[PDB]
């Protein structure tokens, strides 16, 4: 429109209908100039990397991008509490995104002092990768998302991508992408940008915990009409004896379904005053290999974090680890991080730090005793049932399913909704503004630009579909609740210095339903 | 998906079976109940045509640098690749895959 | 149709309308099996060639082809005489082609004796290269065309083609063509084949000889209003003198147009009892080089064969040479060949064995005498006019203009009509009939086939447009005529052994018109 | 046809000429007939877009063996051809012609 007219209003609210909840969040953003308007080839050689497992090749772009792939970007703690305490499931339906109130500033430094002024004629470029023609980086748990607290002003993360690499070198199959080779809208201070997105059909997330275990689905009062081998020797003559499988021996009863797959993780205890044989963080970790590179199995298949009563143990890399407010980047203590756990899925999923089971490994005879072997990793078998990893308030929402010939249960392993066509990447960049050029023609590209940055507001609205609970359970359910006991600060609030903090990870599985 | 490569189908193209009808030789002038085992030596020849329509998925890549492409080598050789020899023998000098273009993962 | 019904009639006649003549010719052909149904790579190594100039690489196909690219295939000598004596020009308009009365025979050899019988179920395959996707070999003066005498039965020539070569080896750019990769009609004894073709617009061939010379177009009674430098020295003082160019000095008169281009050829005399300095057939020949290979300039640009009264001389390779009936293939005497001449174009074209002219090569002064140099080769200049090479009864009719970015006056240098889309190649082959295969499966291609050949009739009808003469010349014209004087045989007739012969080449340029 | 390569036209795309309008500095308070030679130092910047529609002539070759094609080399290298360097410098490593497909003469 014009310089003196706002291009949008501040929309931040949650609307709770019967089977739907609509979340709207608005944030103020700041966008600097990245790479001084240049594309730069990057690799482990440029960053000084040495290990083969961490070698990479890619490019850093002068473009930023908007990321809102975390639940706290849309749900307040109270809204999250309502959702998890009142619904058996939820899933995103549609998306509305807006950019408005664009403000481009120029920075001039004379001597140790910088002056900031408006540049009303400068432009900011925004486009969406609706055709998914660029590498998708929103499927990784990267920082730079919209802040959970609406009053926080955030910096737009720089967009970068990786391609095929051989050490620090590239190959002929490696791809280079120029983001200026895409049509993009150019916005001055009076312009705004908006688009709508429809989520593809995804299953409802399981925001419930099973009230029954897979091995306890039988009637505890009635025998089965099936027999099991109860005795082999009479007291070395072979005397086979069979007995009815009933309530007194539930472990041997016939069952129609079995627990889901497993990929065993090393067990680590958080208890203080403990000794360790050696440094086993990398050496003792479960991993998978691709083209000679070892990658940590993290978080891996959805498995129960620990057995009943063993909350002190957690899988080495089988759980999401969040950092508390103010936590450092490198080598922080256990009390500075928040270790999530998936104990709710112990009713259907195997324990992460235990073998799946035992399998016969020979043919027993009068000369050879029957032998069994531990199954540390078990693939998918017919009749298996399992629960996917729970999602969290500060955890990811969705991920892009890789474009491959085949996949199985493409639920993101870090939690969330897997989609072939997720919300498109939204890329933003400040248009370069050259400084005064020389009065004589020079064919070289200009490298002198006016120092600029941009700021504005961003709004994203997502409609969520709800799956209401119809339980006939008589006794009250477990519910997420704040603790009344006095404390120096209110949980999920600001401190005396105005710092917002999330004191604990919040799952979604508090209500119960039968298996 | 077939492990040797290709398209797996519950109802693939049906088997097409062909046989020359037996033509008995001169039978004896007195009835014999045994099946005939004397036949005229025969063989058949003809032409066979098969037409298949293939659907294509075009590429919409935004890649800037040129892709890898299958190409013949200009360097001189005694014979042209995928052609006949001086004795009329056709040969396929190398296996050719399908994966030269690129797309993101 | 059926075995016992003819699929076509014998059509061979010429119909003379006012401005059009329609020629129809029918011939009986025989088609054997070529290369034993195989494609074979051929080169100068396979044929034993050694010279770089004659090195080649290509393929020989089991297919034959029909060629009617010679005028005597359509015009009888009497029709040719009428055409050349009564018309100033002619050009082909449309084409009709027919194959019918297909007869496929099988040959069986027991011991030194062959038996031929019909194979009613065998097929012959015919298709036309209407899209010009195959190498065009009809543009070369190859043998194998329809015989001039309708009663002669001819053998179908085998189709072969050449591609890019480096010595006896091929390169990556070389192309291999499989003629079975084309849709073709399969004909049994009851079937027939036919198609129609329309000639693209071409200029009328010049079937006239100019009655004026390019240097004698002025009025012989009136002076020009232009002056020429007549004198330089007064008898070494420079005294310029100028004079009117008039009838007394026609050589110095100003002229608006000049003779056409030239590429000088060595002069060879047919007179007996003559001595030669050395063997100059190849060493003394004019040639052009392409990629290091030298090719004889033959017949080269259309130039006058000899000056007036010098009929004994002919250019070394600037004239078409036809062989008399029964003439051998290698090293025949001059009396066994018929040397064509282009003396009719001496009025506009330069003499083949003479320089185009003289050009100044220095600046004359009081110290240096004026110098001139002979122009042995002269390219196209503005104001040039020329006549193309004449066509002959036994000469070629058309040629395919090479598909190139540029060309100039694409009239075929051997004579005829140049076309981007000439009459398409008509390719024919006997379908292989395998012998008895083994009773056990063998994956190798079959190499045992029934010996077969095919025969039938071929008809081609061409409509020609005529350009009538409207001359006001008073005295009678020169006309082609037979000689009444007694001879043992009639010219253009059969001998006592039934051998048809063409005793002389017949041009088209007997009538006259002004320049 | 232009000898350096390309399409020759009597009426090619017209020349597009651009200039910053001079902005005089403060003139003297007394009239002077001489043309002004004191101007405010200025420069301009903006975006330029050009769209060209090209007509294509498809190939209908009957050639059996594969053609020569322009392709990137898979072998590892420090930089991707036709891409930016570690300093953001774009480079074109080789000239690319147009004549790789083949047709008869």
From TrEMBL, chains A, C:
Cellular component aspect of the GO annotation: T=1 icosahedral viral capsid
Domain of life from the UniProt record: Viruses
Binding site for Ca(2+) 1: 341, 344
Positions that bind Ca(2+) 2: 344
Compartments, record wording: Virion
Entry binding sites for beta-D-galactose: 249, 282
Gene Ontology molecular function: structural molecule activity
Chief place where the protein resides: virion
Keyword Calcium: yes
Family, per entry: Belongs to the parvoviridae capsid protein family.
The protein's name: Capsid protein VP1
Species this protein is from: Adeno-associated virus 9 (AAV9)
From TrEMBL, chains B, D:
Bilayer-crossing regions: none
Lineage top rank: taxon: Viruses
UniProt-annotated location(s): Virion
Family: Belongs to the parvoviridae capsid protein family.
Protein name according to UniProt: Capsid protein VP1
Gene encoding the protein: cap
Full protein: residues contained: 632 to 736 of 736
